[PDB]
């Protein structure tokens, strides 16, 4: 793992709520878990063909988003796990994330940008 840490992630549909998740950046893939020691990830996000951009949020600090450039409306390819264990495709067009400090933000971006390239 090149980087791991707690981050708040925005999810839901109509009402979007922030969830604290444990992220693990590892070779072209960004995983996230509910608990720091869980064996199976709550989500896997392949980084190929994605970019990051900082964004401003009204309720949360140090945010940034994973997104598909020039997106005409497609969803980010990713797998997700359901409370019943069933695996399904992610339903995000973008992943908005909140880092605890501005420093953790720049590190995560630098780490992720570098993880999207040489692969
Ligand atoms: O807990 P509640 O309030 O029900 O909201 C859930 C969680 O935020 C999920 O995050 P996590 O999987 O990290 O627990 C998220 O899945 P994503 O991981 O795909 O964001 C769901 O988004 P959608 O199922 O896509 O609407 C959203 O409905």
Swiss-Prot record:
Subunit structure: Heteromer. Composed of TAMALIN, CYTH2 and at least one GRM1. Interacts with ARRB1. Interacts with ARL4D; the interaction is direct. Directly interacts with CCDC120 through the coiled coil domain; this interaction stabilizes CCDC120, possibly by preventing its ubiquitination, and is required for neurite growth in a neuroblastoma cell line. Interacts with FRMD4A. Interacts (via N-terminal domain) with INAVA (via N-terminal domain).
Residues binding a 1,2-diacyl-sn-glycero-3-phospho-(1D-myo-inositol-3,4,5-trisphosphate), per UniProt: 9-17, 21, 32, 42, 80, 91-92
Function: Acts as a guanine-nucleotide exchange factor (GEF). Promotes guanine-nucleotide exchange on ARF1, ARF3 and ARF6. Activates ARF factors through replacement of GDP with GTP. The cell membrane form, in association with ARL4 proteins, recruits ARF6 to the plasma membrane. Involved in neurite growth.
Effect of residue 21 to A: Abolishes phosphatidylinositol 3,4,5-trisphosphate binding
Domain notes: Binds via its PH domain to the inositol head group of phosphatidylinositol 3,4,5-trisphosphate. The PH domain is necessary and sufficient for plasma membrane relocalization. Autoinhibited by its C-terminal basic region.
Location(s) in or outside the cell: Cell membrane; Cytoplasm; Cell projection; Cell projection, Growth cone
Protein name: Cytohesin-2
PH domain: residues covered: 1-117
Effect after changing residue 80 to A: Abolishes phosphatidylinositol 3,4,5-trisphosphate binding
Tissue-specificity statement: Present in all tissues tested, with highest protein levels in brain and adrenal.
Result of altering residue 15 to G: Increased phosphatidylinositol 3,4,5-trisphosphate binding
Residues of the full protein shown: 260 to 378 of 400
């Amino acid at each position: 793992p090149d980087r791991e840490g707690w981050l708040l992630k925005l999810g839901g549909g109509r009402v979007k709520t922030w969830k604290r998740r444990w992220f693990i950046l590892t070779d072209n893939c960004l995983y996230y878990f509910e608990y720091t020691t869980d064996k199976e990830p709550r989500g896997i996000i392949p980084l190929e063909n994605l970019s990051i951009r900082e964004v401003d949020d009204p309720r949360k600090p140090n945010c940034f988003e994973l997104y598909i450039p020039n997106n005409k409306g497609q969803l980010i390819k990713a797998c997700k796990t359901e409370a019943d264990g069933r695996v399904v495709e992610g339903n995000h067009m973008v992943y908005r994330i909140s880092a605890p400090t501005q420093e953790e933000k720049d590190e995560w971006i630098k780490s992720i940008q570098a993880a999207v390239s040489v692969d």
